[PDB]
Structure 1
Amino acid sequence: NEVGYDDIGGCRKQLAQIKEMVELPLRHPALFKAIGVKPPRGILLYGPPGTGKTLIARAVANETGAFFFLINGPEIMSKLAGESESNLRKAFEEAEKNAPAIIFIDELDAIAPKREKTHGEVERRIVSQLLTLMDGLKQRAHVIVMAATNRPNSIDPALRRFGRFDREVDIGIPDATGRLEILQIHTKNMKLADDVDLEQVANETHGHVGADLAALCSEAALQAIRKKMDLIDLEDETIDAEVMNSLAVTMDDFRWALSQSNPSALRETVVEVPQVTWEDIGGLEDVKRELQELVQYPVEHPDKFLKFGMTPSKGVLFYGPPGCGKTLLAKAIANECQANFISIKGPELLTMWFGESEANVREIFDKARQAAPCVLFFDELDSIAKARGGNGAADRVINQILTEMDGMSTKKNVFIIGATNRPDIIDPAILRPGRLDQLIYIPLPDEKSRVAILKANLRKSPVAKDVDLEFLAKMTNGFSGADLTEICQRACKLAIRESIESEIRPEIRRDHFEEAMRFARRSVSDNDIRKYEMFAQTLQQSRGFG
């Protein structure tokens, strides 16, 4: 029942790194003495609350069978003056005595927050005490100091120097696959009903971490209990095993649990492999292949580019009318490469405090650098361009993104994609060679694509046989992909109204589409098109006078 690597999900790659760093020095202490080579001193774990940092630390302890001294942050800082530093000493001393050992400083930010942030002396002194104890590991007596924090920044940078906490591991929020994993770990002991689709749970559970899912499984269970409780006994101090087995956790119980679901970490910049594919995008076949040659090749065939003497381009700019699949393409190519993907929307960049707006863009480019191969996607750039002239802060952010672009070495597998519905006000700086020099024009869908889009959106929907999507495409000439989805949504909304009113079983049929087309609208004017067509050629010249 104790903790082990089998009790951890979503942290596959990270848990592998920690294993590599720690296994040799711990399982083979004698060997490492003989080599003379230097092992890792400190391992810092960061990530939002409830991602399983304390868990992994306690897991690595039992699995390596190393001596384990837990240093609770809040516990130290709750004690008196010298007793704090005195306990820090004992913790190291006792750990060194029973080597090999792992000292785990949980909630490190409590002990050693920003040495400038802290007010007083006894606090600063405790930080100094820690820095000495870390440096005091020059005895090297096979001790590994692990630590956990939610504030990777608030930790006094002195701790992240070489010889102290020199290695770090981003145990971030889990993705769709990771959440499924954790759900299985906590539903491991439950008798799940057959209608329970944990895959569905994991997918509509966007902003949950390990602690959230653990509580979510606990929630669905306690509700299923309270039901068949009904009569039970209660007066009896204990329930027998016979009853507990007959107990089943329905999918409904999980849905009730998902109702009270308060996701811990939302807007926490997500880093995952998009579930969007080429199949979700109608048309653009030429651009799709072009995206591969830019992203697929340099990562899967570095030997070619090195032998050809050319270095690949860094970034791409999607520009064209609104709702033509610019966001989709960005996610699509990342999925094709099965590379990580980060989407920062323009407004998200204009949200931050003025001071944070610089230190947080660095966090992004660092998160992309570490999650390599990765597709860093700056979507909705138009909303930023407007905030500069009115077509202050937006100025500082873009200049930061430019600096961060140049600084990132081309030999890294990070690929930057920018997108905007408006190339008439895009900063020319972004378009200069070495930045987003690959200017891709994504226009309104041609007739062939419109059919593909219609089928793509009505894929999972019950459309009648007599419905002619090809004719429908023939009628919606100047319409965008977003519009065609809305027409489908409009037509589907009518079919639902009929279902409730008459109970005719769900069939979105012909006359539903016909009326939806009656009210249909063109979200991109002719004049707008002519402009986009001009920028499809002359956007190259926007860095001159223009």
Structure 2
Amino acid sequence: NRPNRLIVDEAINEDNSVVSLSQPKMDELQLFRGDTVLLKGKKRREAVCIVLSDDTCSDEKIRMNRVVRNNLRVRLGDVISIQPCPDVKYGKRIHVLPIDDTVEGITGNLFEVYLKPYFLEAYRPIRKGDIFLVRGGMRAVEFKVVETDPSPYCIVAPDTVIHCEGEPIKREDEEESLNEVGYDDIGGCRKQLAQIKEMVELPLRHPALFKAIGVKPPRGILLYGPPGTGKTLIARAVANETGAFFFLINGPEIMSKLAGESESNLRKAFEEAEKNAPAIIFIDELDAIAPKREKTHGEVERRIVSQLLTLMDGLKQRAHVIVMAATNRPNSIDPALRRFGRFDREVDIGIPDATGRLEILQIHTKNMKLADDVDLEQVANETHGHVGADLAALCSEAALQAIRKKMDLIDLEDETIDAEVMNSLAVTMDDFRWALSQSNPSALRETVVEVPQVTWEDIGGLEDVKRELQELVQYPVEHPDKFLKFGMTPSKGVLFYGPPGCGKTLLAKAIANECQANFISIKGPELLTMWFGESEANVREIFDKARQAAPCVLFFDELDSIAKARGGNIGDGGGAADRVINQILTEMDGMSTKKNVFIIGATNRPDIIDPAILRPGRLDQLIYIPLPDEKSRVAILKANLRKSPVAKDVDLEFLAKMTNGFSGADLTEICQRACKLAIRESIESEIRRERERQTNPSAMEVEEDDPVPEIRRDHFEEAMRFARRSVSDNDIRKYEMFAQTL
């Protein structure tokens, strides 16, 4: 049909019960008097109402009726097109079971009252499955059979009221049992849900495609990744919408112990579905029944893993009843992915973003009145990194806490809890936010959903550094043909100068967060001075890490520290040192050439770390990402003092000019020392004042928040005099000249 969807408005006819059949229904199709436009529904649902229509009188282009829309569960503006439907059955005689809920709670014989209105004025034709309006229960009747041995399509007479099974339906049929909190815009991931639906359909509705492709031994979908979340309970509202098949209900599996019988029934179900068309019934307690090499180091867990491998390698692509995401424990999942079915493909899982939080908030608002002016954008922003079951659970808890607080503050609510009082005392957006802050998501941290050690603005300046990072991001995505016709991409590796704590790791993390990347923030003497021998060992470890986490920007900062100047040319130690140096040269001369392995080293001198790479020998282009020069030490000290207690007169420019030779963290140490000295002075003054007050009730008091509530400029100058400047002026000029001449 059409690729752009629309929404269907209300019916043109004012009366909802007047659902006039369209002229096209009787024109394109031979719509007789006893049949109307048969509406297709979800999970193999179909309903047609016998109503006489006059196409020659008035062809009203009205929309669907409200009752018809509710019964058929027709989407708003769905493309009403006739396509091949191979999942429709037929029958001869059926038993029209009455509603069990209407029988209970009715005074006297409810069957006599039900049959009184069933024969005449029942609003139901002569067929099985007709729902009738009942008083009480406040629930819908829509049940899906996971695997029914019999068929669901058969005609039934209305004059014979057949007895039901006697079991009332307590569960809310319209809703879904699983995915209670794990609900996002498309159920977590649109791509993953689409892939699951396609696997469920094509393997069950297009067996010819599988036969021509020849993948018979393929199991199906056994996903991982989203383990432990409400994605563990993501079976319903995705399979409930997809529905379930019939036949081959289950094995007996009733011994309550099932030592080897659990494996026997599992193998039988795996083999039975390979030649049948049963539904993919999600395994209840899938991790519990199948330890999957996670529970015990004995035989049960390994046996579970092996049985999972056999089932994934022993089931055809017809049912694929495999738990996804959290199938087994995340640490040791079942071998259903290790065997056929997920051994070559991953799951397109959507990350927890503000979209999932907003969808959960919308679902909650539809379910209950959160607030009159609930800031769902604020809720989504506060739980942007946490979306899914955690976000919905936290929002529900916050709303419940806010509503409870509002009800308690409104009155005692111990004699007559007014429904208007509770609904009006909605969970205020501020109150809900406060309760959510008091609450927590399932994840240990909501900020752990991104890779960001430092903000892009936290790294002061970095103008040419950010320029180089953006160029690397773009020319590889913008103009990759420009690089290809131009040859190869530029070499990596920066050489910073000055003191340590230059922010190279911080700037790299800032860029990676701005690039939504997990930069491999490498340490110092952790690649060259490798602990497993020569530098080649750590180089290969980093290569494997970058290949498994591409792009993992191997931020091998502090090349001067990376070398660590091992030395020791005596006996076998000299051999080890020479091997380490040669391995470092080899890694710098060919390594994992992907994942943007940029090593922003520290350049204490021209030969302090790898003079050959410092010369244009190893690096064809020693691309040092220049940063804009700022008094970032002054700004950092200002932020720290704001975090502490220094105010009033602060000759920050007058003092920072004395030692301008800083590398961000260089002057921060002096600031920290001055802050510590000021805090010690304040504590001493407080102790002296307390002693004076103890000696005499009115002797002394506290001057301010600190003995020096302003900047302890005297203490700062005293610390500076006790310490020394970072470098001399002649040495600084020589270093600047050396950097410029290169």
Change over 3 Å in CA distance of 1:131–1:342 after alignment to 2: same
Q: 1:58 to 1:135 in 2, by over 3 A?
A: same
Q: Provide closer, same or farther for how the CA distance between residues 120 and 516 of structure 1 changes in structure 2, counting only shifts above 3 A.
A: closer
Shift of 1:241: 4.4
Residue 221 to residue 276, structure 1, CA distance change in 2 (3 Å): same
Structure 1's 146 and 457: CA in aligned 2 closer, same or farther, altered over 3 A?
same
Q: Which has the higher contact order (CA 8 A, sep 6+)?
A: 1
Indicate if the aligned counterparts of 1:282 and 1:456 stay in contact, CA closer than 8 A: no
What is the CA distance between 1:91 and its match in structure 2?
A: 4.2
Does the residue aligned with 1:7 lie in a helix, a strand or coil? coil
Partner Cα separation in structure 1 for residue 422 and residue 296 of structure 2: 52
Tell me if structure 1 keeps the 8 A contact 2:407–2:421. no
Displacement after TM superposition at 1:160 (Å)? 1.0
Shift of 1:220: 1.9
How far residue 88 of structure 1 moved from its aligned partner, in angstroms, is 1.4
Pair 384,142 (structure 1): closer, same or farther in 2 beyond 3 Å: same
Per mean C-alpha deviation after superposition, the further-off stretch among 65-74 and 117-126 is: 65-74
After TM superposition, give the deviation of residue 52 of structure 1 in Å. 3.5
Secondary structure of the residue that 2:589 maps to in structure 1? Answer: helix
Instruction: Tell me if structure 1 keeps the 8 A contact 2:505–2:557.
Output: yes
Name the CA shift for 1:51/1:516 in 2 (closer, same or farther; >3 Å). Answer: farther
In structure 2, the residue matched to 1:62 is 240
Q: How far does residue 131 in structure 1 lie from its aligned partner after superposition?
A: 2.5
Q: Post-superposition shift, 1:369?
A: 5.2
Task: Mark the runs of 5 or more structure 2 residues left unpaired by the alignment.
Answer: 1-178, 570-574, 688-708
Q: State the alpha-carbon separation in 2 of the partners of residues 436 and 298 from structure 1.
A: 20
Instruction: Kindly indicate whether residue 540 of structure 2 is the aligned counterpart of residue 357 of structure 1.
Output: no
* 1: CA distance, partners of 2:337 / 2:635: 55
Alpha-carbon distance between aligned partners in 2 of 1:496 and 1:383, rounded to the nearest angstrom:
33
Cα distance change of structure 1 residues 120 and 387 upon mapping to structure 2, 3 Å threshold: farther
Alignment check: 8 A CA contact 1:340 1:374 kept: yes
Answer yes or no: is the 8 Å Cα contact 1:464–1:507 preserved in 2: yes
Q: CA deviation at 1:217?
A: 1.9
Q: What's the offset of the Cα at 1:425?
A: 8.0
How far the C-alpha of 1:477 sits from its partner, in A, is: 2.2
Structure with greater proportional helix content? 1
Change (3 A) 1:357 1:449: closer
Tell me, yes or no, if the aligned pair for 1:191 and 1:248 is still in contact at 8 Å: yes
Q: Structure 1 residues 171 and 35, CA, compared in 2 at 3 Å: closer, same or farther? A: closer
Residue 184 to residue 383, structure 1, CA distance change in 2 (3 Å): farther
SS of the residue 2:618 aligns to:
coil
Confirm or deny that 1:25 pairs with 2:203.
Answer: yes
Of residues 485-494 and 260-269 in structure 1, the stretch that sits farther from structure 2 once superposed is: 485-494
Is the aligned partner of 1:105 residue 2:283? yes
2:466 aligned with 1:283: no
Contact 2:503–2:664 (8 Å) recurs in 1: yes
* Secondary structure class of the residue paired with 1:140: coil
Moved more, 63-72 or 78-87: 63-72
Say whether the 8 Å CA contact 1:220–1:254 is kept in structure 2. Answer: yes
Cα separation, partners in 2 of 1:241 and 1:179, compared to 1, 3 Å? same
1:114·1:156 contact (CA, 8 Å) conserved in 2?
A: yes
Partner residue of 1:484 out of 634, 644, 667: 667
Change (3 A) 1:302 1:182: farther
Structure 1: stretches of 5+ with no match in the other structure: 540-546
| Distance change in 2, residues 1:334/1:69 (3 Å) | farther
Offset of 1:261 from its aligned partner? 4.6
What is the deviation of 1:83? 2.6
TM (normalized to structure 1)?
0.62
Shift of 1:115: 5.4
Deviations 1:458-506 (A, max 9, x none): 99999999999988876662234346789999999999999999999x9
Secondary structure of 1:335's aligned partner: helix
Conserved in 2, the CA contact under 8 Å of 1:324 and 1:443? no
Q: Structure 2 vs 1, CA of residues 225 and 336 (structure 1 numbering), >3 Å: closer, same or farther? A: closer
Q: Tell me the secondary structure at the aligned position of residue 323 of structure 2.
A: strand
Q: Over the residues paired in the alignment, what is the CA RMSD in angstroms?
A: 7.5
Distance change (3 Å), C-alpha of 1:180 and 1:317:
farther
Q: Percent identity?
A: 100
Q: Distance in 1 between matches of 2:404 and 2:199?
A: 46
The alpha-carbon deviation at position 134 of structure 1 amounts to 1.8
Matched residue SS, 1:89: helix
Asked if the contact 1:368–1:375 (Cα under 8 Å) also holds between the matched residues in 2, the reply is yes
1:117 is paired with a residue whose SS is coil
**Gap change, CA 1:210 and 1:143, over 3 Å in 2:** closer
Deviations 1:268-306 (A, max 9, x none): 995636596655443332333233344432233221222
On the 8 A contact 2:180/2:230 being kept in 1, the answer is no
**Preserved contact between residue 66 and residue 101 of structure 1 (Cα < 8 Å):** yes
| Distance (whole Å) between structure 2 residues aligned to residue 441 and residue 459 of structure 1 | 33
Per-residue deviation at 1:100? 6.5
> Alpha-carbon deviation of 1:84?
0.9
Go from structure 1 to structure 2 and tell me whether the alpha carbon gap of 1:299 and 1:137 turns closer, same or farther (over 3 Å shift): same
Alpha-carbon distance change, 428 to 16 in structure 1, aligned in 2, over 3 angstroms: farther
Matched residue of 2:476: which SS? helix
Aligned length: 538
What SS does the corresponding residue of 1:491 show, helix, strand or coil?
Answer: helix
* Conserved 8 A contact 2:501-2:665: yes
**Alpha-carbon spacing, 1:513–1:135, altered in 2? closer, same or farther (3 Å):** same
Q: Give the structure with the higher percent strand.
A: 1
Contact 1:193-1:249 at 8 Å conserved across structures? yes
- What's the CA shift for 1:531? 10
Whether contact under 8 Å (2:455, 2:513) holds in the other structure is yes
Once the two structures are overlaid, the 10-residue window that deviates more, 286-295 or 269-278, is 269-278
State the Cα deviation string for residues 71-120 of structure 1 (Å, max 9, x = none).
99999998431331133135436756773733545776656656598544
Instruction: Tell me the SS of whatever aligns to 1:75.
Output: coil
Per mean C-alpha deviation after superposition, the further-off stretch among 193-202 and 477-486 is: 193-202
CA contact (8 A) 1:216 1:258 kept: yes
Q: 1:211 to 1:534 in 2, by over 3 A?
A: farther
Q: CA deviation at 1:320?
A: 5.1
Aligned-partner Cα distance in 1 for 2:624–2:731:
14
Secondary structure in 2 matching 1:514? helix
Normalization by structure 2: what TM-score?
0.49
Q: Counterpart in 2 of 1:114?
A: 292
Task: From the superposition, tell whether residues 509 and 351 of structure 1 become closer, same or farther in structure 2 (CA, over 3 Å).
Answer: same
Q: In the aligned structure 2, how far is the partner of 1:17 from the partner of 1:403? A: 44
SS in 1 for 2:505: helix
1:326 positional shift: 1.4
- After superposition, give the CA deviation of every residue in 1:156-211 in whole Å (9 maximum; x if it has no partner): 76851445644333859746776676566656656556897666666676985744
Q: Quickly say closer, same or farther: Cα 1:357–1:531, change in 2 above 3 A.
A: same
Report if the CA contact (8 A) 1:112-1:155 is conserved: no
Deviates more, 1:393-402 or 1:39-48: 393-402
Aligned-pair CA distance for 1:227:
1.4
